[PDB]
Amino acid sequence: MIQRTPKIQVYSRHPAENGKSNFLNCYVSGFHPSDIEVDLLKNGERIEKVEHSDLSFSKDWSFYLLYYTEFTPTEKDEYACRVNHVTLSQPKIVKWDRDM
Amino acid sequence: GSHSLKYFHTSVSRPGRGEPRFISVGYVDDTQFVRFDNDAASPRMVPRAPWMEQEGSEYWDRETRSARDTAQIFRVNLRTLRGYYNQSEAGSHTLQWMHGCELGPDGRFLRGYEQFAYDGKDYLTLNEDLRSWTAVDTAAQISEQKSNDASEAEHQRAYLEDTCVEWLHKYLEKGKETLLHLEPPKTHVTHHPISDHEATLRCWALGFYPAEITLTWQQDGEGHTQDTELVETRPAGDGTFQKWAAVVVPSGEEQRYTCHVQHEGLPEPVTLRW
Amino acid sequence: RMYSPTSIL
């Protein structure tokens, strides 16, 4: 059986501007199998009921998903994405960087 | 220009938890427009783009029947392949199927494809001649033998070259204002000094459609790149895409680096500097 | 329009 670890990007739909509404995105891609747990965090605590896109896959059969929720960037708030998968010996946390 | 209608079907067996999970998504170019998820009492094919609501009740009924039948067929396929490989009931396994058309600039059928994957690896593939198959191993040769017995390539050739091509034309018309409207990227360069000697230059491309784009940190020959990083094109979540390219440059050599951006929505390629 | 499968693997 085949295993591929997810590639993770945490970003926003629009360039972040403190106080203005936006969308926090976590894009997992290139992983296999499809079973994957993805959470969005506000200051280390899971954001309530985040949404995600429909399961699709690439030319090499690896899956990709977009997990997203509405959020408002703040200078003090630290957002992140927490990913759990078969290929990870422990959940991987990726900080949100407003210039990446 | 080139256009494609693609369906991506995924079936994952649940050991001890019931019948397999089945998910189907349809794409027109880089735009998802339909979805089917069998994890419901009465699962239905549902639109995933607003312009698909222009289709009547019978259309959705027909796709719902097609998708529910596919889900059952894939449940049989999972049991069949599990028997081919002498695999127990305790293992969860995945069968994937991608299917669809591609049009050339001339608007006619250009290339069709039908491919099967078992557990993330190639299994059975219809070749571009649309008459032969490629089996990855001994098991898939049995599936190829079944496909030849049933003239499966003949039925696929008629779907890929005709039924699929006709409906792609119908979808490009309904989603005309969004599918055929190119969104050029909005581009800007940011600057971050890693240290007193060096600095990062990051060229941004935001909100473009379709996903095909090229971001290049061109250089006048005398730049001494310390590091570089291109990120995979990622969905913005509103139908458009994002991408950036970065380069670590000696501070004082910023002007030797230009960012070249290519995209179908651009009347000319865009060059921009910090 | 998706394709209702014709044969079994």
Numbering used by the authors:
A (entry chain B): 1 to 100
B (entry chain A): 1 to 274
C (entry chain P): 1 to 9
Task: Copy text from the publication.
Human leucocyte antigen E (HLA-E) is a non-classical MHC class Ib molecule homologous to H-2 Qa-1 in mice and Mamu-E in rhesus macaques (RM). HLA-E exhibits preferential binding to a highly conserved set of nonameric signal (VL9) peptides derived from the leader sequence of HLA-A, B, C or G molecules. VL9 peptide-bound HLA-E complexes engage the natural killer (NK) cell inhibitory receptor, CD94-NKG2A, thereby protecting healthy cells from NK cell-mediated lysis.
The P6 RL9HIV and VL9 Cα atoms are separated by 4.2 Å and the P7 Cα atoms by 3.4 Å (Fig. 2h (i)), disrupting the ability of the RL9HIV P6-Thr and P7-Ser side chains to occupy their respective C and E pockets (Fig. 2f (i) and (ii)), and concomitantly rendering this region of the peptide more solvent exposed (Fig. 2h (ii)). However, the extended conformation between P1 and 5 of the RL9HIV peptide, arising from C-terminally shifted backbone arching, positions the P5-Pro Cα atom only 1.8 Å from the VL9 P6-Thr Cα atom, with the two side chains deviating by as little as 1.2 Å, potentially permitting a degree of compensatory C pocket occupancy. Despite minimal Cα deviation facilitating optimal secondary anchor residue-pocket alignment, the P3-Tyr side chain is prohibitively large for shallow D pocket binding (Fig. 2f (iii)), instead projecting toward the α2 helix in the C-terminal direction of the peptide.
